[PDB]
Amino acid sequence: AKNVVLDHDGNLDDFVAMVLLASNTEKVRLIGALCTDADCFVENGFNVTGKIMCLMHNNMNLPLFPIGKSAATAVNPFPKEWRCLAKNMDDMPILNIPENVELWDKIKAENEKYEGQQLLADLVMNSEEKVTICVTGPLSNVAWCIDKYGEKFTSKVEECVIMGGAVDVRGNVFLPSTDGTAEWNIYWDPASAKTVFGCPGLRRIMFSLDSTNTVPVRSPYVQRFGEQTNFLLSILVGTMWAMGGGYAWDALTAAYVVDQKVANVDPVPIDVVVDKQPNEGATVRTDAENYPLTFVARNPEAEFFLDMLLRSARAC
Amino acid sequence: SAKNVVLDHDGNLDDFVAMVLLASNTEKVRLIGALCTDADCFVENGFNVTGKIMCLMHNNMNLPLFPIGKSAATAVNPFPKEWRCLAKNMDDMPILNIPENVELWDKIKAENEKYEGQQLLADLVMNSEEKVTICVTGPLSNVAWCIDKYGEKFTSKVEECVIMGGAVDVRGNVFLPSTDGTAEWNIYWDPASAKTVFGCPGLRRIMFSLDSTNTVPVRSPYVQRFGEQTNFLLSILVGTMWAMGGGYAWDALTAAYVVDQKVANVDPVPIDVVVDKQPNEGATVRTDAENYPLTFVARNPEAEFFLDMLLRSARAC
Numbered sequence: 221a222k223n224v225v226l227d228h229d230g231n232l233d234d235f236v237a238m239v240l241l242a243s244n245t246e247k248v249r250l251i252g253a254l255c256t257d258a259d260c261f262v263e264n265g266f267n268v269t270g271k272i273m274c275l276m277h278n279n280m281n282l283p284l285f286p287i288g289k290s291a292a293t294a295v296n297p298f299p300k301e302w303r304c305l306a307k308n309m310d311d312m313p314i315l316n317i318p319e320n321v322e323l324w325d326k327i328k329a330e331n332e333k334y335e336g337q338q339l340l341a342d343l344v345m346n347s348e349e350k351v352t353i354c355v356t357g358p359l360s361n362v363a364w365c366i367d368k369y370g371e372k373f374t375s376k377v378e379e380c381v382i383m384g385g386a387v388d389v390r391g392n393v394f395l396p397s398t399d400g401t402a403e404w405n406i407y408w409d410p411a412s413a414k415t416v417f418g419c420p421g422l423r424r425i426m427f428s429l430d431s432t433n434t435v436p437v438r439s440p441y442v443q444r445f446g447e448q449t450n451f452l453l454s455i456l457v458g459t460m461w462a463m464g465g466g467y468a469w470d471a472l473t474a475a476y477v478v479d480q481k482v483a484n485v486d487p488v489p490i491d492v493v494v495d496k497q498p499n500e501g502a503t504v505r506t507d508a509e510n511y512p513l514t515f516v517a518r519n520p521e522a523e524f525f526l527d528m529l530l531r532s533a534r535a536c
Numbered sequence: 537s538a539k540n541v542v543l544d545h546d547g548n549l550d551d552f553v554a555m556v557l558l559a560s561n562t563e564k565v566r567l568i569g570a571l572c573t574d575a576d577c578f579v580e581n582g583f584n585v586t587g588k589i590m591c592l593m594h595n596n597m598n599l600p601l602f603p604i605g606k607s608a609a610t611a612v613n614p615f616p617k618e619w620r621c622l623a624k625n626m627d628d629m630p631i632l633n634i635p636e637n638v639e640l641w642d643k644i645k646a647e648n649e650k651y652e653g654q655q656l657l658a659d660l661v662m663n664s665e666e667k668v669t670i671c672v673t674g675p676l677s678n679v680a681w682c683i684d685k686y687g688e689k690f691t692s693k694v695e696e697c698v699i700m701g702g703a704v705d706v707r708g709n710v711f712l713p714s715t716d717g718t719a720e721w722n723i724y725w726d727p728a729s730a731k732t733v734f735g736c737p738g739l740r741r742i743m744f745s746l747d748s749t750n751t752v753p754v755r756s757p758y759v760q761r762f763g764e765q766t767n768f769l770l771s772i773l774v775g776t777m778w779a780m781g782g783g784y785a786w787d788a789l790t791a792a793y794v795v796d797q798k799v800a801n802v803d804p805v806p807i808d809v810v811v812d813k814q815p816n817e818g819a820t821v822r823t824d825a826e827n828y829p830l831t832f833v834a835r836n837p838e839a840e841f842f843l844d845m846l847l848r849s850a851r852a853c
């Protein structure tokens with residue numbers, strides 16, 4: 221197993237990603253998580269992370285791990301309508317089973333001591349073996365670590381597997397002020413993304429919309445979780461997919477961390493537009509000589525991923 | 537002992553909580569049919585969720601199967617698209633997709649597909665041996681269609697209509713550039729049909745307007761109590777729906793009254809509906825017309841009684 225830290229922002233797919241990482245203990249040792257006030261309100265995202273962790277800890281061999289709220293602030297906030305989803309999950313029956321909330325109330329204070337950005341730096345730098353960071357929210361926290369510690373941090377990262385961007389397809393940030401070329405995780409904090417994508421010392425795998433677009437979440441698939449209601453994780457994952465849209469963005473990204481068979485990768489030099497322009501947050505190919513490479517996921521194995529998640533959701 | 541009830545709903549989350557409340561209380565309520573309207577739902581999804589809930593309950597608490605119809609009613613003023621997708625979400629929920637339950641729904645779905653809800657409502661009421669209570673949790677289009685078609689032949693077979701809709705002495709919830717905020721959505725969706733219903737002399741009406749429903753908020757701690765009951769399919773179902781929903785229990789409170797009238801005392805008010813294209817289109821207003829029919833408006837509902845009733849009902853299976 222390899223050490224993994226989940227750096228997430230508390231939306232539905234972030235939590236599916238969490239379940240995928242945590243359930244696959246043969247491949248993944250989940251040593252920490254941080255939650256950012258991006259596509260959630262951070263207190264709800266924090267609480268849902270804890271409730272999921274406690275449910276799993278009480279039902280399978282999943283060690284407890286530190287959970288930290290990130291101090292990162294938005295450059296461009298997510299729509300309020302999407303940010304409420306962690307609040308909904310916080311109230312779900314599956315996450316409010318007596319034995320699990322009792323545990324979470326008990327261990328909450330220890331996790332309240334953490335600040336997410338510092339926790340990420342510490343977990344990576346203090347690890348004996350290198351750490352894979354799975355980033356399913358904005359890149360603010362990885363950038364903070366790079367800015368503060370530089371090579372002391374980046375040399376300890378096995379790879380940064382990132383959900384974000386849109387390279388050779390349209391983005392998903394459609395606002396009166398934008399041209400639709402940017403993707404939301406990057407748009408939330410463009411400068412931090414620029415720091416991450418341009419860092420020569422960091423290995424990066426990028427699940428941009430180019431790959432996530434090709435793995436739709438369809439109703440008959442979601443309904444298959446209904447065949448598994450004796451498994452708590454299947455109630456959980458099925459419920460979250462049922463509440464979500466048509467994509468599995470962050471879950472696909474986490475699936476790759478579990479098993480790289482999920483997608484092939486192509487090296488591309490990726491820059492980020494940080495200017496206050498219609499294309500703010502766009503991830504763009506750059507011709508600059510010696511610009512660092514990012515390994516962009518291509519043609520993901522949709523069926524393999526979908527099977528992986530269904531199976532993983534039988535862990536408990 | 538049990539009284540005949542038909543649920544006339546539009547497939548939002550509280551409509552389905554209402555359905556569970558009616559169906560789970562078999563001592564008091566014999567649920568003889570349901571219809572779904574293409575209002576605060578896409579009707580195919582509301583139809584499927586109704587079937588899936590009924591089948592789950594049939595297989596786990598012996599709830600008798602009943603006809604489910606889709607209404608052909610069309611909006612005068614349609615609900616926002618962003619609210620109408622919730623039945624689609626529910627249709628994909630694990631709790632509603634357990635194989636034994638879905639196989640039962642698959643077996644009986646085609647017979648239900650063939651109904652048209654408006655005629656179904658008329659037939660269920662008129663062909664019943666005993667009088668029928670109609671619990672209306674969407675727009676009033678279907679009750680109006682029956683009154684228009686059959687008049688006294690229909691209304692004489694109705695025990696009462698228990699209606700979620702309107703706003704009498706409080707503001708509404710229809711907030712548009714063209715409105716003054718005094719109308720409530722179920723009425724605003726089809727004002728003319730609501731007018732027909734509230735002005736009908738042959739008919740006992742109980743009205744849960746925003747006056748009463750505003751006073752029973754659905755809060756996180758209460759919703760989280762369903763987590764104590766995850767051994768019950770209905771607690772997973774109801775808790776999930778409240779967790780997904782907004783701040784109120786509109787239709788569920790309305791159904792609770794059908795189960796037990798101690799939910800609220802009522803106040804007779806002559807209710808007219810504004811149908812002209814004015815800022816308060818869809819408003820339920822007091823009318824001073826002589827000998828105008830009375831509607832019994834719920835006042836000061838028993839919140840704790842309701843909250844307890846629902847937690848208990850959600851332990852039926």
Ligand SMILES: O=c1[nH]cnc2c([C@@H]3N[C@H](CO)[C@@H](O)[C@H]3O)c[nH]c12
Binds near residue numbers: 469
């Ligand atoms: O429509 C949406 N609802 C909730 N979250 C997202 C996102 C978030 N941003 C990423 C995909 O662009 C992914 O991490 C997801 O959590 C994009 N679009 C939506």
Ligand SMILES: O=c1[nH]cnc2c([C@@H]3N[C@H](CO)[C@@H](O)[C@H]3O)c[nH]c12
Binds near residue numbers: 549673700
């Ligand atoms: O936010 C809302 N505004 C207006 N109506 C509703 C509803 C539906 N409309 C009715 C309350 O206006 C009730 O029957 C409910 O099912 C849910 N949420 C809202």
Ligand SMILES: [Ca+2]
Binds near residue numbers: 228357
């Ligand atoms: Ca995310």
Ligand SMILES: [Ca+2]
Binds near residue numbers: 551576787
């Ligand atoms: Ca309704």
Ligand code: NA
Binds near residue numbers: 580649
């Ligand atoms: Na159909």
